[PDB]
Amino acid sequence: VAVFRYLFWLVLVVVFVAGATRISIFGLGYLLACFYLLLFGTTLLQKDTRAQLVLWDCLILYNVTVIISKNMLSLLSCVFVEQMQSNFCWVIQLFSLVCTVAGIIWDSICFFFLLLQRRIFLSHYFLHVSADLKATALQASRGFALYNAANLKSINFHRQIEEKSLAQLKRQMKRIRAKQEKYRQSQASTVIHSGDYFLFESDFLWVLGQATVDGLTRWLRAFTKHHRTMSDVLCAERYLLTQELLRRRGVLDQLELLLDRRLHIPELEEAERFEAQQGRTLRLLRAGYQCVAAHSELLCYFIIILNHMVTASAASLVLPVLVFLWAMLTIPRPSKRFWMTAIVFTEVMVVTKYLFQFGFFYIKYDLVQLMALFFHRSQLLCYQPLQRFFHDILHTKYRAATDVYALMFLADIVDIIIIIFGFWQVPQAFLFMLLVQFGTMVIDRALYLRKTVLGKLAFQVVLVVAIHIWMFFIRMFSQNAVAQLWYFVKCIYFALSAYQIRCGYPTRILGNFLTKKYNHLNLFLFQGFRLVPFLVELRAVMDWVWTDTTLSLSNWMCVEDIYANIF
Amino acid sequence: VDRILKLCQDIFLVRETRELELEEELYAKLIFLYRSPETMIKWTRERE
Amino acid sequence: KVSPPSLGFLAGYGIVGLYVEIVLVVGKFVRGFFSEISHSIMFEELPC
Amino acid sequence: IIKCSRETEKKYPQPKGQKKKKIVKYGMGGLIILFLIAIIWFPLLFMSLIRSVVGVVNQPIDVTVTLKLGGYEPLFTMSAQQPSIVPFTPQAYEELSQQFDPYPLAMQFISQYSPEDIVTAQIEGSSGALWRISPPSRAQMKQELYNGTADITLRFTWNFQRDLAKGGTVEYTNEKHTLELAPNSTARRQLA
Ligand SMILES: CCCCCCCCCCCCCCCCCC(=O)OC[C@H](COP(=O)(O)OC[C@H](N)C(=O)O)OC(=O)CCCCCCCCCCCCCCCCC
Ligand SMILES: CCCCCCCCCCCCCCCCC[C@@H](O)O[C@H](CO[C@H](O)CCCCCCCCCCCCCCC)COP(=O)(O)OCC[N+](C)(C)C
Ligand SMILES: CCCCCCCCCCCCCCCCC[C@@H](O)O[C@H](CO[C@H](O)CCCCCCCCCCCCCCC)COP(=O)(O)OCC[N+](C)(C)C
Ligand SMILES: CCCCCCCC/C=C\CCCCCCCC(=O)O[C@H](COC(=O)CCCCCCC/C=C/CCCCCCCC)COP(=O)(O)OCCN
Numbered sequence: 001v002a003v004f005r006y007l008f009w010l011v012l013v014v015v016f017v018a019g020a021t022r023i024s025i026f027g028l029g030y031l032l033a034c035f036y037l038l039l040f041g042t043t044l045l046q047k048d049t050r051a052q053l054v055l056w057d058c059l060i061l062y063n064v065t066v067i068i069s070k071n072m073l074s075l076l077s078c079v080f081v082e083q084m085q086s087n088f089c090w091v092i093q094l095f096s097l098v099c100t101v102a103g104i105i106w107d108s109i110c111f112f113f114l115l116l117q118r119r120i121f122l123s124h125y126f127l128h129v130s131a132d133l134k135a136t137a138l139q140a141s142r143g144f145a146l147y148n149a150a151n152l153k154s155i156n157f158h159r160q161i162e163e164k165s166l167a168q169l170k171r172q173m174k175r176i177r178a179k180q181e182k183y184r185q186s187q188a189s190t191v192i193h194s195g196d197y198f199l200f201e202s203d204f205l206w207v208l209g210q211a212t213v214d215g216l217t218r219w220l221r222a223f224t225k226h227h228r229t230m231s232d233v234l235c236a237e238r239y240l241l242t243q244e245l246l247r248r249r250g251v252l253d254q255l256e257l258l259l260d261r262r263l264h265i266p267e268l269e270e271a272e273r274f275e276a277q278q279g280r281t282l283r284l285l286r287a288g289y290q291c292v293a294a295h296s297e298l299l300c301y302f303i304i305i306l307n308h309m310v311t312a313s314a315a316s317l318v319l320p321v322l323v324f325l326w327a328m329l330t331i332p333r334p335s336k337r338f339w340m341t342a343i344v345f346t347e348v349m350v351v352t353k354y355l356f357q358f359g360f361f362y363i364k365y366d367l368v369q370l371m372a373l374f375f376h377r378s379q380l381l382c383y384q385p386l387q388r389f390f391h392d393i394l395h396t397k398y399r400a401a402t403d404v405y406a407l408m409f410l411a412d413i414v415d416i417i418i419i420i421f422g423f424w425q426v427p428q429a430f431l432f433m434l435l436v437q438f439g440t441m442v443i444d445r446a447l448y449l450r451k452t453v454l455g456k457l458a459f460q461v462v463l464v465v466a467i468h469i470w471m472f473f474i475r476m477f478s479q480n481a482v483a484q485l486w487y488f489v490k491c492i493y494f495a496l497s498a499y500q501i502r503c504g505y506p507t508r509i510l511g512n513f514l515t516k517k518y519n520h521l522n523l524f525l526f527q528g529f530r531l532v533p534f535l536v537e538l539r540a541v542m543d544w545v546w547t548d549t550t551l552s553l554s555n556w557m558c559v560e561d562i563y564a565n566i567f
Numbered sequence: 568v569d570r571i572l573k574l575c576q577d578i579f580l581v582r583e584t585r586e587l588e589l590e591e592e593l594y595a596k597l598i599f600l601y602r603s604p605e606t607m608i609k610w611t612r613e614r615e
Numbered sequence: 616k617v618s619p620p621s622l623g624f625l626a627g628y629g630i631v632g633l634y635v636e637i638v639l640v641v642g643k644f645v646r647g648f649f650s651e652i653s654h655s656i657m658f659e660e661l662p663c
Numbered sequence: 664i665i666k667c668s669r670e671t672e673k674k675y676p677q678p679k680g681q682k683k684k685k686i687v688k689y690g691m692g693g694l695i696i697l698f699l700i701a702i703i704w705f706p707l708l709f710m711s712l713i714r715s716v717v718g719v720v721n722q723p724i725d726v727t728v729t730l731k732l733g734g735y736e737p738l739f740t741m742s743a744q745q746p747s748i749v750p751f752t753p754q755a756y757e758e759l760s761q762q763f764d765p766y767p768l769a770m771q772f773i774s775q776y777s778p779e780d781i782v783t784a785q786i787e788g789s790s791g792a793l794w795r796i797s798p799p800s801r802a803q804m805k806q807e808l809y810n811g812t813a814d815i816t817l818r819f820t821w822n823f824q825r826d827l828a829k830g831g832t833v834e835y836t837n838e839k840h841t842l843e844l845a846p847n848s849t850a851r852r853q854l855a
Contacts (some may be wrong), residue, residue, distance in 0.1 A: 195599030533642035659751040
């Protein structure tokens with residue numbers, strides 16, 4: 001399978017690297033071919049063998065023409081001193097005419113890989129592999145329906161849980177109202193001063209490492225379980241379809257929810273047994289590959305911000321901003337429009353970098369972005385007033401609506417620790433960014449306590465655009481390396497915040513998180529929080545500032561101290 | 568301390584539902600409880 | 616160049632110290648002022 | 664104070680309507696929070712500003728060099744005063760830069776010391792004064808240089824005298840350069 005199915009992507013990578021390594025204007029053809037094939041490979045593999053054979057014959061003709069052109073160009077390269085030196089310099093930079101004495105190994109390597117893949121195309125192994133790819137292309141709608149069923153079931157479960165929680169809240173509220181009115185009737189026979197006793201009526205070393213790695217791979221399987229299930233059911237279905245395929249949906253009923261109730265095929269069972277047999281040394285790496293395939297999207301964000309962070313601060317920074325505002329706010333699927341815009345941006349940026357690399361008028365980091373974006377797009381395999389329409393979609397109040405607030409607070413705290421440690425002018429700017437971070441803490445608390453969402457969106461966009469345009473003022477590798485980690489922490493904070501925006505602030509979100517269970521750990525963490533100066537009193541004052549209450553400041557502080565002591 | 572914990576949690580929840588017309592009553596009960604040690608002894612016996 | 620020697624006990628050992636003691640003492644004073652006010656309510660909730 | 668609070672409550676009795684003193688709220692918390700932000704920002708600010716220093720250059724007003732042989736007397740000594748002390752213009756600074764452009768250490772070392780931080784003295788080599796020599800000293804010079812197969816060394820030394828308005832702590836910084844010569848060698852022979 002590795003040789004007959006995973007080699008075309010490898011030869012595409014080889015073409016790209018050969019085009020990038022040579023700076024002269026002959027690898028421009030290699031880059032354009034790489035982009036075209038990377039876009040059209042899926043539809044190319046499904047067509048009739050003659051089409052691909054002709055296309056790859058055209059490609060090998062291009063390869064032999066470029067190598068022959070270099071061979072004949074060596075002649076003028078070695079007659080450059082007389083005429084070409086100090087004359088027609090633009091052409092000598094364009095073609096990079098240089099003698100050898102080897103230096104064209106990459107072009108020959110790509111030619112070899114081209115012939116090898118052509119021979120693979122001739123084989124029958126590729127024939128049934130193409131049948132398998134056709135089946136996978138067919139089952140896309142069924143996979144989409146399965147995913148939709150799973151997500152609707154999860155949403156319904158969350159809705160029912162929320163419904164029962166609100167029912168319990170209403171029951172508690174009825175209970176307290178009944179108690180207070182009964183007390184009123186009992187007393188029938190400012191108000192803060194009132195109160196009387198009548199309210200109080202009593203009415204052996206290898207095993208360690210192997211077990212640890214087994215636990216790690218079990219955790220990976222637990223993380224991937226849903227993807228494993230859908231992939232397994234889809235692959236079993238595709239196997240039975242292609243076994244049936246000799247020459248509607250009714251033929252698929254030989255056997256919606258994640259149901260395994262079906263017949264069995266011995267070959268799949270034997271394959272499962274065999275892949276269980278090979279758990280000695282590839283289990284962890286297979287689990288990791290399955291994890292990166294199942295997720296396949298957050299690592300695109302990872303690479304995008306690493307490339308924007310690694311020395312590409314000039315023009316890459318625009319593209320993460322779009323992410324923070326477009327990929328991860330609109331819909332749980334950032335979708336085809338975002339992906340095509342990002343990828344066309346990457347391709348145009350790399351071709352501009354290559355053209356500006358010449359003398360007539362990088363690749364390593366961006367090739368990773370290209371392969372990641374294409375791999376994710378392949379994995380997905382299913383597809384003026386619109387701005388205001390999308391803004392309206394951002395405020396609908398129809399999602400799962402979960403709140404995770406401790407996370408960005410912890411991210412901000414870790415950011416403060418990083419900024420404090422970032423000393424052993426950048427140290428001068430550290431003070432300003434520290435103060436504005438404290439201000440952001442205050443205002444995000446303000447936004448959270450009033451349950452506002454549109455204000456949170458406005459804060460998110462303004463904060464991200466400000467913190468990204470702030471890199472105009474950004475030793476570089478030694479001292480200015482904590483700053484990039486600090487920016488990465490800001491990224492994780494932004495991700496958490498925008499995820500919260502997508503969720504949408506569930507009701508009944510108040511009180512002290514740490515006071516959830518009365519265990520020893522909660523006690524210890526609560527005391528540790530109480531041991532940091534100028535936090536608990538500020539948190540009380542601020543909660544009182546933004547919440548809607550009736551007690552003067554001292555009464556609020558009294559109640560908070562009382563709650564903490566009794567807790 | 569279960570009774571007082573329930574009382575304070577009731578204060579917080581009646582707060583989070585924006586019915587401010589019970590917060591004063593609940594706070595008055597709490598402040599009166601803390602105004603007299605005899606009642607807090609009376610309020611903190613052991614269940615059977 | 617020439618730099619004034621007013622730096623003297625620079626940060627990391629001297630002045631950073633003096634700072635940390637003063638911030639701890641002021642924080643303790645404020646925390647005692649704001650948190651401890653529960654025990655005296657017998658002497659302020661006096662209505663008349 | 665409790666009674667006065669009660670009376671001022673009676674003067675303006677707020678209704679049962681809650682609204683918890685919204686605007687007063689916004690004021691008081693605001694003042695409180697600024698105070699909390701105020702205090703801690705100050706001894707950091709004061710911590711940092713008290714540490715900020717301007718890189719005021721200290722250019723020596725005067726320079727002296729001397730050339731002494733043995734422990735007997737200085738043979739020669741000059742002092743370039745004002746006009747033989749040329750501070751580098753920026754253009755001279757770039758010139759020093761490209762002359763040592765391949766070498767990275769030279770570039771960083773120049774990049775630190777600004778053109779105002781680097782000067783050149785045009786010491787007048789030939790514009791000397793009379794080198795008096797007590798003839799006893801002269802005779803012993805000659806006799807030792809001719810037959811005394813001992814080792815005699817120079818005491819060549821540079822002193823830099825600073826502006827003393829531009830500070831500079833010690834303003835007579837100097838270093839000595841003592842290098843022994845070779846007897847029975849043409850150096851001592853030509854000196855004799
Ligand atoms: C430190 C890190 C190290 C990382 C190392 C990474 C791996 C490095 C080595 C990789 C080697 C890859 C070699 C691939 C060779 C492919 C050859 C191939 O596809 O031939 C295909 C051949 C020829 O067609 P045919 O079947 O005769 O066609 C006529 C008709 N159809 C028929 O039925 O006849 O038809 C066939 O049926 C022949 C099949 C030949 C299959 C050969 C597969 C070799 C795989 C080798 C994998 C090595 C992995 C090493 C991993 C090391 C890790 C440290
Ligand atoms: C400085 C000099 C150079 C400036 C160059 C500026 C160039 C600007 C170019 C802008 C191009 C924008 C392209 C946007 C492509 C969007 C593709 C589309 O598919 O995305 C949609 C989403 O579109 C986004 O909402 C658009 C967001 C636009 C935000 C614009 C912000 C502009 C800010 C400008 C700030 C300038 C500051 C100063 C700069 C100097 C997805 O919607 P979808 O989920 O399918 O809808 C589902 C419903 N259906 C089925 C009916 C479709
Ligand atoms: C401490 C923790 C341990 C980790 C430490 C770091 C270790 C780093 C190790 C790096 C691992 C790299 C993983 C490589 C994954 C490659 C995935 C690539 O092959 O995907 C291809 C597809 O790629 C896409 O088509 C886009 C083109 C990408 C081309 C990538 C070529 C990779 C070549 C790898 C060569 C490795 C050489 C190693 C030499 C030693 C094949 O996928 P396909 O069978 O279609 O899948 C169909 C079903 N899907 C779509 C849902 C997945
Ligand atoms: C150089 C060292 C500086 C100190 C570093 C200390 C590092 C400690 C690392 C971990 C600490 C994490 C624990 C604290 C996190 C609390 C998370 C949280 O829940 O957030 C709020 C945050 O608390 C507040 O709202 C008050 C703080 C926000 C205002 C921030 C003021 C400015 C930041 C001051 C930082 C400290 C300055 C000196 C350093 C000491 C601590 C950093 C409190 O809980 P609630 O919201 O009730 O829980 C609700 C559950 N749904």
